[PDB]
């Protein structure tokens, strides 16, 4: 399965999705800079509308514990 095919379900906790992401990211062998680009970009983009909304409110500069606690009720 390709990294672009990794997406969050409509009922799937973000948490279970983030695990899937760094597992597939774990099978990507690209430069770190590209993998940083993938992190800030693709993760949020394939996140579900309800959490996506939430993550837009965190702004930039956000870290994984704060994202992970931010989308917990969703």
């Amino acid at each position: 399965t390709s990294i672009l095919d990794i997406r969050q379900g409509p009922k799937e906790p973000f948490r279970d999705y983030v695990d899937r992401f760094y597992k597939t990211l774990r099978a990507e062998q690209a430069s770190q800079e590209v993998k940083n680009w993938m992190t800030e970009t693709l993760l949020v983009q394939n996140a579900n509308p309800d959490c996506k909304t939430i993550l837009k409110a965190l702004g930039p500069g956000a870290t994984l514990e704060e994202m992970m606690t931010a989308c917990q009720g969703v």
């Binding site: 695990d19 760094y22 597992k23 994984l64 514990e65 992970m68």
Partner: protein, 147 residues
């Protein structure tokens, strides 16, 4: 790891498969539970950075946590470099170079270099510095993964 030989010197010996597998099995069974940290600590006795990356790289699963740890290891490493600046002028022929965050993380150093630092007199505890970063990052994980 770097262990003491019968002759009375410190030499490197490889870590054992049923030690490796015991590390694997702990992670399989107790995931993020706190008992993992003393357990880690015992199995990391006399261990190198190189052996510590081996242990981290051989994990399967919990990739969100594995990424959070990585990023903690680099932060703690960035902080090592910040706090300890490089030293004045060129490196002496008679001496060996001071480590950076990435030598502590094992990345920029070779094994023989890791053995130089630890076996030399005074010795420098680059294992124990990485160990705190691992334990610190383990606290981060444990605290997050509490439900």
């Amino acid at each position: 790891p770097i262990v003491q030989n019968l002759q009375g010197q410190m030499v490197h010996q490889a870590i054992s498969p049923r030690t490796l597998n015991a590390w694997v099995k702990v992670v399989e069974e107790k995931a993020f539970s706190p008992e993992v940290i003393p357990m880690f600590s015992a199995l990391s006795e006399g261990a190198t950075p190189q052996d510590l990356n081996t242990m981290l790289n051989t994990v399967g699963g919990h990739q969100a946590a594995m990424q959070m740890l990585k990023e903690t290891i680099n932060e703690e490493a960035a902080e090592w470099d910040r706090l300890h600046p490089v030293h004045a002028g060129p490196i002496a022929p008679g001496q060996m170079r001071e480590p950076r965050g990435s030598d502590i993380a094992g990345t920029t150093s070779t094994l023989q270099e890791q053995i130089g630092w630890m076996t030399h007199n005074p010795p420098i505890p680059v294992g124990e510095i990485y160990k705190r970063w691992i334990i610190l990052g383990l606290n981060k994980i444990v605290r997050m993964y509490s439900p």
